[PDB]
Amino acid sequence: QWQELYRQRVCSADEAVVDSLKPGTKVVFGHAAAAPVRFSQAMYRQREKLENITVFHMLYFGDAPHLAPEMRSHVHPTLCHFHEVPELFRQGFFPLDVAVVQVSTPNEEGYCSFGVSCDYTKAAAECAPVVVAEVNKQMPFIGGENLIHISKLTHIIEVDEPIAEVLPGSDLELRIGQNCASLIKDGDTLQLGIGGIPDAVLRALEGHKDLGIHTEMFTDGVMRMIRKGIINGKKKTLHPEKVVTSLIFGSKELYDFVNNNPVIECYPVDYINNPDVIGKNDRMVSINSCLEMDLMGQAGQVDFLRGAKRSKGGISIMAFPSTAKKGTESRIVPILKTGRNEVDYVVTEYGVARLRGATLRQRAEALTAIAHPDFRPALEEEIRRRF
């Protein structure tokens, strides 16, 4: 019986903060919608006892108390190929002492699931001699290499509390979506973000068949298409018939859909984002969105560039809106405020630009052609002074 262990290791958040957080300890929190805010809440209440605690993390959803100024001298936070984060632990760059994660209720064999976060959070759990897991009756159970046994948990804080939600097209954005879809083939195993552009893209793909998934994250958009019959990874040559990521967040509907669903699986990033693994998926098409680009081709985002460039028939698209601050500012510049032999296509509301196989001069102007119209003669002017 492992429930007799379950019983022997359960405490309150506060008792777990106090016993697990020796002066000078460093701690890592699991991330995104699996962020262990109860434990953050307990570190707040118990502040007057904590001494030199360092915390490491990335996305937190709800987690107030640590950057609360009164944490000063009690706990401070520390910090771009996403797939290498896990190596910070597995190599001692960040000598984590305690990993604080939020899992789900364990199953008939005493196995809990990381739920909506595998990413760096499971590697951390594996590299910490003390693991504090909030056991959440609301955390969904999702499979793949996403499990952790009850016996690896030092302190269990049983709770019950809804998994933070983030609800996710638009005019411009939609046209962006539409142009991407001319690059995407029935049968392609995609990678996209979360946001206007991604949800646009999936809107543009409602006339596609057999698509597959292999992203570092996904939202409600994916549910929707799995739902309509379009995402099925029947053609996937890696994890055929299932949607793989490293994390998930979105609405309560997302959470209830992914709970206990065979066709969804998590894996950590030191895998999912590995260009080598990415590569094994054919027709892999990654779609990312950078914040500015130059007349030359220069801007997890990068992991997927590289890894898209290894699958047979893969490509990589950078899609973004041709301006910023209501069209005052061009996201395409001569000179930027990660060099070119990176991306194959670039898409804006004004259309497509092919980069794989282009001269310095074509890349320049094929881009200028999809820039905002105001900016095109300033831009075209620049090419001329370069030829």
UniProtKB/TrEMBL annotation:
Protein's UniProt name: 4-hydroxybutyrate CoA-transferase
Family (UniProt): Belongs to the acetyl-CoA hydrolase/transferase family.
Cited InterPro entries: AcetylCoA_hyd_C (IPR026888), AcetylCoA_hyd_C_sf (IPR038460), ActCoA_hydro (IPR046433), ActCoA_hydro_N (IPR003702), NagB/RpiA_transferase-like (IPR037171)
Species the sequence originates in: Porphyromonas gingivalis (strain ATCC BAA-308 / W83)
GO biological process, one term: acetate metabolic process
Gene name of this polypeptide: abfT-2
Molecular function GO terms recorded: acetate CoA-transferase activity
SUPFAM superfamilies: NagB/RpiA/CoA transferase-like
Record-annotated Acetyl-CoA hydrolase/transferase N-terminal domain positions: 4-167
